[PDB]
Amino acid sequence: KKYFMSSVRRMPLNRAKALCSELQGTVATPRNAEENRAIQNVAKDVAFLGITDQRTENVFEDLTGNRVRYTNWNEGEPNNVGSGENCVVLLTNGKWNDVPCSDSFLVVCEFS
Amino acid sequence: KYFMSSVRRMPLNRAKALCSELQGTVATPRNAEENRAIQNVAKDVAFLGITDQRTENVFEDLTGNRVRYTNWNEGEPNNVGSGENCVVLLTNGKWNDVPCSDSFLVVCEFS
Ligand SMILES: [Ca+2]
Ligand SMILES: [Ca+2]
Ligand SMILES: [Ca+2]
Ligand SMILES: [Ca+2]
Ligand SMILES: [Cl-]
């Protein structure tokens, strides 16, 4: 089964990736509503998910380059504001928001 | 409990910081079953969340609880040199006390 754990400190996606990979896990990528809720359970605040549209704008993939199926975008998202928002966070209501990969948020790691 | 191993080596203070960052702790086997599980996730010698830093030869977990189950390698713990107050799980599953300043892999434990 997948197990999700939340970080205590906030950091940009690249550091979030490094943190989860340090324990041989990955940044949490919910594949369905059950997993999305499981991530909500552990994230006490806005937290990074392992999804990006860095390759092609508006084509969201997990960190292994696998195009995602399930999405739970907050109304109005993804909006790619300004210079670009190519990373994704799980808001406190469980919905998603695309944000700059360089911005800092808690991270939820996934292990199985 | 879920056990995960790090890929890089680091001293105990950094190991504690890593496990704590994801709200866990350095793995502390409470019986032979947990000891084997940690051994299996660790690909090389790794730190356990046990030390005798507070009182020499009184081994406790990182929350101050004295440990009951132990699996010391023959001749251990020997507190050699200027002192060894940290503990590692060897590749055969037995334990060895080592300097906390030394670098080893870390196995984190989560509930
Ligand atoms: Ca984008
Ligand atoms: Ca947005
Ligand atoms: Ca000692
Ligand atoms: Ca020793
Ligand atoms: Cl020491």
- Token digits for A16? 């979030």
**Terminal CA-CA length for chain B:** 4
- Token digits for B107? 């196995």
Distance from CA of A28 to the nearest CA of B (A): 13
Q: Which residues surround ligand 4, an ion (CB under 5 A)?
A: B 78, 84, 96-97
Contacts of B75 (CB under 8 A, 6+ apart): none
Contacts of A23 in chain B (CB under 8 A): 4-6, 18, 22, 108
Contacts of B8 in chain A (CB under 8 A): 22
Inspect the interface and report whether the beta carbons of B7 and A21 lie closer than 8 Å.
yes
Q: What Å distances lie between residue B6 and A81, A111, B3, B14, CA to CA?
A: 37, 13, 10, 11
Nearest CA in chain A to B19: A23
Convert B13-40 to b/e letters by CB count within 10 Å (16 or more is b). eebbebbebbebbbbbbeeeebbebbbe
- Token digits for B20? 């704590």
H helical segments located in A9-93:
13-22, 33-42
Assign domain A1-112 to its CATH architecture: Roll (3.10)
Q: What is the dihedral sign for C-alpha B41, B63, A19, A101?
A: positive
Distance, CA of B22 to CA of A20 (rounded, Å): 9
Enumerate the domain spans of chain B.
1-111
Ordered DSSP codes for B32-80 = HHHHHHHHHH-SS-EEEEEE-SSSTT--EETTSPBP----BPTT-----
Distance, CA of B18 to CA of B20 (rounded, Å): 5
Centre a 10 Å sphere on the Cβ of residue B11 and count the other Cβ atoms it contains. Answer: 17
Q: Which residue has the tokens 């002192």?
A: B83
Q: What Å distances lie between residue B42 and A32, A43, A66, B84, CA to CA?
A: 31, 28, 29, 21
Q: Taking the CA atoms of chain A, what radius of gyration do you get in angstroms? A: 12
Inspect the interface and report whether the beta carbons of A7 and B21 lie closer than 8 Å.
yes
Q: Which residues surround ligand 5, an ion (CB under 5 A)?
A: B 85, 99-100
Closest alpha carbon to A96 in A81, A74, A79: A74
- What technique was this entry resolved by? X-ray
Inspect the interface and report whether the beta carbons of B2 and A109 lie closer than 8 Å.
no
Distance, CA of A13 to CA of A21 (rounded, Å): 12
Inspect the interface and report whether the beta carbons of B6 and A23 lie closer than 8 Å.
yes
Question: Where does B1-111 sit in CATH, by number?
Answer: 3.10.100.10
Inspect the interface and report whether the beta carbons of B108 and A23 lie closer than 8 Å.
yes
Q: Tell me how far apart the 2 most distant CA atoms of chain B are, in Å.
A: 36
